[PDB]
Design a protein around this ligand. Structure first.
Ligand SMILES: OC[C@H]1O[C@@H](O[C@H]2[C@H](O)[C@@H](O)[C@H](O[C@H]3[C@H](O)[C@@H](O)[C@H](O[C@H]4[C@H](O)[C@@H](O)[C@H](O)O[C@@H]4CO)O[C@@H]3CO)O[C@@H]2CO)[C@H](O)[C@@H](O)[C@@H]1O
Length: 377
């Protein structure tokens, strides 16, 4: 049942932490941030050139977050990979430690602060997000074996809630072709080699044999099947990791009490979506978009839905409509009780979204955070 004494599960659409010994069951909310970098060529969370890593965790906790999503790539989780770009005068206790050991230090420290950690297999290599959970050089069995090894090691950390199986499944070509061409993820198409709903079952079973106490977070795709995507006017305009419209007819075949649907959703700073034009109904059009793409999965079907990524520059050097977009989304999440989330990102160095921290890696965008804060209250 569990190597830690803690078992995570979903009841209703709420995530529970169970102390299996005492029998105590606590419902948890995930007020989370993404702290990225283990999936990049640095092979470490970013900003350790400007900050101490512990100081960073303390500051995250001081802002009322109690959860971190930790993106990783294959390399960062194999021993002996060496981190690049760390100021060791600021980080003495990180000297002579590899990308895996830092990852472990960060999680144990987070746990010390009651912070939950979601492990995210973000990239297969360490440069970009592939549309599928395999490449020419890295097979699905290789991907599954990496997850098995991640799960054997990090399953011993009480505060690790589970596995975001693959960051942002998506297409690298357009429909109708994208559905049959074998280069991008699908859902409900039929082909188990591209259909993310079927691959998430395989990879998830594999993880649950070794970390039975974990949760399996399954993102949306970008396109699913033409019948599903055609069912809604904005069916062809979902985010990578964002399209959960096929959950109703093609549910992932996994234990309901272990599964979390985890959509990405973004504003005009990531992509100039047609429904972001006031002409196409922005911003009042947004509740119904979100509903159709992923909101109905919780609100109609009652599964647990955790928004794994959302964010934007909040009018700081980007599209000013992002302020309206972030306000409207928080309003909607509060009204509809989506209280579990990971903001993208803690890091200021996300080129299209910036982060909670400003470019100085020290100070927060007060207004962006203030708006986010309403969800924590
Ligand atoms: O990892 C560090 C890296 O992160 C970047 O932040 C990305 C996230 O890593 C990622 O999970 C997510 O990816 C975006 C992606 O960057 C966009 O190109 C893509 O745009 C899609 C859109 O989704 C579709 O609807 C549209 O049809 O096609 C476009 C592509 O043309 O959207 C996905 C998410 O849906 O979100 C983060 C923000 O982009 C930082 O930007 C980078 O600087 C960091 O190095």
């Amino acid at each position: 049942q569990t190597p830690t004494g803690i078992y995570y599960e979903v009841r209703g659409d709420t995530i529970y932490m169970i102390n299996v010994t005492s029998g105590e069951e606590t419902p948890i909310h995930l007020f989370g941030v993404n702290w990225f970098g283990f999936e990049t060529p640095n092979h470490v969370v970013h900003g350790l050139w400007k900050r101490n890593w512990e100081d960073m965790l303390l500051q995250i906790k001081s802002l009322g977050f109690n959860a971190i999503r930790l993106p990783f790539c294959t390399e960062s989780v194999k021993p002996g990979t060496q981190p690049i770009g760390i100021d060791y005068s600021k980080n003495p206790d990180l000297r002579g430690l590899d990308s895996l050991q830092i990852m472990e230090k960060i999680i144990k420290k987070a746990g010390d602060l009651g912070i939950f950690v979601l492990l995210d297999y973000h990239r297969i290599g360490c440069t970009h997000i592939e549309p599928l959970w395999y490449t020419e050089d890295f097979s699905e069995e290789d991907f599954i074996n990496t997850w098995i090894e991640v799960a054997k090691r990090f399953g011993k950390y009480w505060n690790v809630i589970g596995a975001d199986l693959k960051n942002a499944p998506h297409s690298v070509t357009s429909p109708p072709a994208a559905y049959t061409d074998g280069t991008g993820a699908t859902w409900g198409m039929g082909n188990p080699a591209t259909d993310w709903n079927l691959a998430a079952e395989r990879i998830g079973k594999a993880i649950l044999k070794v970390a039975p106490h974990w949760l399996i977070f399954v993102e949306g795709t970008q396109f699913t099947n033409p019948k599903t995507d055609s069912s809604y006017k904005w069916g062809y305009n979902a985010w990578w990791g964002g399209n959960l419209m096929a959950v109703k007819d093609y549910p992932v075949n996994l234990p309901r009490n272990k599964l979390v649907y985890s959509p990405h959703v973004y504003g005009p700073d990531v992509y100039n979506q047609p429904y972001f034009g006031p002409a196409k109904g922005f911003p009042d059009n947004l509740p119904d978009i979100w509903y159709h793409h992923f909101g109905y999965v919780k609100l109609e079907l009652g599964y647990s839905v955790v928004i794994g990524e959302f964010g934007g520059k909040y009018g700081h050097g980007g599209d000013p409509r992002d302020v309206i977009w972030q306000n409207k989304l928080v309003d909607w999440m509060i009204e509809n009780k989506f209280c579990d989330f990971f903001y993208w990102s803690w890091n200021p160095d996300s080129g299209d979204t910036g982060g909670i921290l400003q470019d100085d890696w020290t100070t927060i965008w007060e207004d962006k955070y203030n708006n986010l804060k309403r969800l924590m209250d």
